[PDB]
Design a protein around this ligand. Structure first.
Ligand code: AXS
Ligand code: NI
Length: 341
């Protein structure tokens, strides 16, 4: 049974609601982005209309084998009519193809569904600038002040500098980056670029990256692992055992591994600054956990909501416990009293 916070009132629309069977009343299923918790339930035998970005559409077709007749890609930043209702897709600053959706209801109500997003001041000059939003369905992943982390630019600067130093000191070192979904591609792309290398990966991960409309992608990635000194592996293999095993396969070409595990927030954010971050080391293998987030920090979220001044907020993350729900409701009231809406 589909939960209330995935239904759009006054419409036949659901958002990220593919694991509940045939939802009664739903004429169009929107998909904000290609992450498994959100697409859960979609497969090649789906037979209702799916509305999404072009990039999400590419992934549905090629990775999940959803038939072409049911995929409805929409351009960004463009007023579109779907089943008699005006909608707009906006960039979410999440993973490739991720969108927020603006719905202009027949009765005059305006609803923004953020999907998953990393709020940014640039959103204050999108098509949101114009007008009033009555209901906000909000990605509240990190809605508590303890959730701090650096900008994506600061994290990438650290990764580039760390990798360039290590390989200039030891030209026989291999760099490895963990992945388990789309998103955070800048980490491995920026490291490979500083090292003058393509990024090597499995056939399955290459296929995924070929769906993302990244400019000049054929110049940046490869399935030929031997030609590359930056490799991608599943996140699960980024540990001393898995990396030891990988180094064996490389045919005495390398004598050191430097590995990166992009995480979200971890409690080491509460003590250590990005500049002060150190790896876990065993012999000739070192592993860095780096806090590269594709969700809003608490401060970024607060800024966005205080700018938008929505009449009602509906959280879409951390809704499963009374304590979490109460905590979020308290912050929403603080933000409203401070800003005066
Ligand atoms: F949005 C929320 C609000 C509250 C919580 C509960 N845990 C928060 C604690 C542990 C880690 C940092 O503070 C989770 C998500
Ligand atoms: Ni996501």
């Amino acid at each position: 049974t589909c939960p209330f916070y995935k239904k759009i009132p006054g419409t036949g629309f659901t958002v990220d609601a593919f694991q509940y069977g045939v939802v009664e009343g739903c004429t169009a299923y929107f998909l904000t982005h290609f992450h498994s918790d959100h697409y859960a339930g979609l497969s090649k035998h789906f037979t209702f209309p799916v509305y999404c970005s072009e990039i999400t559409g590419n992934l549905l077709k090629n990775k999940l084998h959803v038939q072409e007749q049911y995929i409805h890609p929409l351009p960004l930043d463009t007023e579109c009519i779907v089943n008699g209702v005006k909608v707009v897709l906006l960039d979410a600053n999440h993973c490739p193809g991720a969108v927020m959706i603006l719905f202009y209801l027949p009765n005059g109500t305006v609803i923004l569904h953020t999907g998953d997003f990393r709020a940014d001041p640039s959103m204050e000059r999108s098509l949101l600038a114009d007008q009033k939003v009555h209901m906000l369905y909000l990605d509240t992943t990190y809605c508590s002040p303890e959730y701090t982390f650096p900008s994506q630019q600061e994290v990438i600067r650290f990764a580039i500098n760390t990798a360039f130093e290590a390989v200039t000191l030891n030209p026989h070192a291999l760099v490895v980056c963990g992945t388990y979904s789309i998103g955070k591609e800048k980490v491995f792309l920026a490291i490979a670029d500083v090292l003058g290398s393509k990024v090597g990966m499995s056939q399955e991960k290459y296929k995924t990256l070929q769906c993302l409309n990244i400019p000049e992608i054929n110049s940046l990635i490869t399935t030929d692992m031997c030609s590359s000194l930056v490799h991608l592996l599943p996140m699960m293999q980024i540990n001393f055992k898995g990396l030891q095993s990988h180094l064996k396969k490389c045919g005495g070409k390398y004598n050191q591994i430097l590995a990166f595990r992009p995480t979200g927030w971890t409690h080491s954010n509460k003590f250590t600054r990005i500049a002060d971050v150190i790896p876990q080391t065993k012999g000739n293998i070192s592993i860095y956990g780096i806090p590269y987030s594709e969700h809003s920090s608490y401060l970024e979220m607060k800024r966005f909501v205080q700018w938008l001044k929505p009449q009602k907020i509906i959280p879409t993350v951390n809704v499963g416990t009374w304590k979490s729900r109460s905590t979020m409701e308290k912050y929403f009231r603080e933000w409203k009293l401070e800003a005066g809406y």
